[PDB]
From a paper:
A key step in the assembly pathway of double-stranded DNA viruses, including bacteriophage and evolutionarily related herpesviruses, is the packaging of viral genomic DNA into the procapsid. During this process, the large terminase protein docks onto the portal protein, which is embedded in the capsid wall, and translocates DNA using free energy liberated from ATP hydrolysis. Cryo-EM reconstructions reveal modifications to a canonical capsid protein fold, resulting in capsids that are abnormally large for this virus class. Structural information on the portal protein, through which the genome is packaged, demonstrates that the capsid influences the portal’s conformation.
Residue numbers in the entry:
A (entry chain A): 24 to 397
B (entry chain F): 60 to 117
C (entry chain B): 235 to 397
Write the structure that this text describes.
């Protein structure tokens, strides 16, 4: 029954087409890249534009041309020291339960085996894709990758801390937004706050908040903000002394995202899925409250790199596979008989082109603003 | 067939996400917890109710 | 008018532009509001200006990087420049002095970007270098020959605070 490795590859290509048919924000920001190397250069360097422009030289006649300072290239002379974190696992089936399920099927052994194997393949691909998502998200929400020994996806307890060195991924806040002062009032306008971010980025071309990202519920914090309430009241045209007595809450809940999107002008792309840990909880990739925000531009950023494979090289010389590797195993001839399969590869998300004139690089930052959510 | 299985089964989503494993170099793979199809092992007890009828004329 | 940077806030602080938006969008500060927010004015400033005065407001910031690493724009913050004859190509940029050998014969020089390299790998530092450069000047479009003056474009200053 459990056979057909070439058909397993075909059905795996079908499952990958089904997985990559839909796409996500976090998937959109990083393409899939594959290298035969393993040096794991943590960031590329790419900063040469009219923001780094400079202007040319006067000279009078009769002399040699005074040379061009190219100190960005000499500053770019450095090395990249980081190590690729693999991720790999394998699902196994005991022959006892496969003859249990073969007698349970009893109409097509290889067909129900094909269905069950392809189901487990799709689920394990989902585990792979969520590993990739947790990598990319764990760096972009905190600037760096940290592995404590107590991850539900770290049973071994292997720890790693690999940093990339974004300057300030956090943002200043004197307090959260929805603190209540006076009788009942917002502490601060968020829209006027992001106006202050643009006001600070008056000079600076890469502080200006371009497009914001927040997945779960945050709208209600806006709906409680009496500044945003006042925007909605002036927008739709109600004085609480004269035109209305008290507006209701789902007005604010309806209009807050759009009035924010119009008045601040940065896009609010809301894209959360969930990750299901071992502990039974269901959390979103974004945690509730806080929100990351791009403030240079909007486009791709970084790179998800496939670190090269360790495999049987060839009969002679060395060469390796470079994509999603796939192979089957039997241990049914053995003292515990078990049928197992393995596909999960070595990889790393890389950051974008670092700035080259200085070493600083901050394109995305975040702030925490919700001391009570649920 | 007429066995009348009381429930179908289909559940594989991002609320059933899972992820890969932090494994070190050069060791054996820590394998997959197989709780899904093991907990799925059950038998259904239901029976079809056939609905049949026939008019007649005097 | 041509002006690059954020001056829309400087528009929004002008209370006549405020009262423009107040009556135009239909809000009395005595009756229909106590005070409107600042950022409706921010959203409305360039549009209320363009529909009211009726001249094309082409707003264009360009990132100007000088030697000491700070960032500016070509137009400085605040003020403006303004055309007042027509919209159309004023001026011209002239590239002169196509320098080479003068020649073995007569001067019939080329007119475009010529570039050449200079290797010096034989020398006391053995170095490699490239040259390019343009002897040039922007030539303004001259007046109609009646007067001596030519004023197609002027400006004024108001940014008594930069920030």
């Amino acid at each position: 029954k459990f056979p057909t490795t070439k058909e397993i590859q075909e059905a795996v290509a079908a499952i990958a087409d089904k997985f990559n048919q839909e796409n996500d924000l976090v998937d959109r920001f990083f393409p899939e890249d594959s290298t035969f190397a393993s040096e794991l250069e943590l960031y590329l360097l790419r900063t040469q534009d009219a923001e780094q422009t400079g202007m040319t030289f006067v000279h009078q006649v009769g002399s040699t041309s005074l040379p061009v300072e190219a100190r960005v290239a000499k500053v770019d002379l450095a090395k990249a020291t980081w190590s690729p974190l693999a991720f790999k696992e394998s699902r196994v089936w005991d022959e006892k339960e496969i003859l249990y399920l073969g007698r349970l099927a009893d109409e097509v052994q290889a067909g129900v085996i094909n269905e069950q194997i392809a189901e487990s393949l799709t689920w394990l691909m989902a585990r792979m894709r969520n590993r990739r998502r947790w990598l990319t998200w764990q760096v972009m929400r905190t600037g760096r990758i940290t592995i404590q020994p107590n991850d539900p996806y770290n049973p071994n307890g292997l720890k790693y801390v690999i940093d990339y060195g974004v300057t300030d991924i956090e943002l200043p806040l004197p307090q959260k937004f929805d603190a209540k002062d006076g009788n009942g009032n917002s502490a601060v306008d968020p829209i006027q706050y992001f106006r202050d971010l643009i006001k600070a980025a008056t000079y600076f071309p890469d502080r200006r908040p371009v497009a914001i990202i927040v997945g779960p519920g945050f709208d209600e914090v806006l709906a409680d903000n009496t500044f945003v309430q006042k925007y909605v009241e002036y927008e739709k045209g109600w004085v609480v002394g004269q035109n209305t007595v008290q507006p209701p809450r789902e007005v604010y809940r309806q209009a807050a995202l759009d009035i924010f999107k119009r008045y601040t002008g940065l896009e609010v792309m809301v894209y959360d899925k969930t990750y299901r840990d071992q502990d039974g909880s269901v959390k979103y990739w974004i945690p509730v409250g806080e929100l990351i925000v791009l403030n240079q531009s909007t486009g791709p950023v970084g790179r998800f790199v496939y670190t090269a494979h360790v495999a049987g090289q060839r009969n002679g010389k060395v060469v390796y596979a470079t994509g999603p590797y796939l192979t089957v195993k039997d241990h049914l001839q053995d003292d515990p008989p078990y049928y197992a399969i393995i596909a999960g590869f070595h990889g790393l998300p890389q950051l974008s082109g670092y700035n080259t004139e200085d070493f600083s690089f901050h394109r995305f930052k975040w702030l925490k603003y919700a001391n009570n959510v649920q």
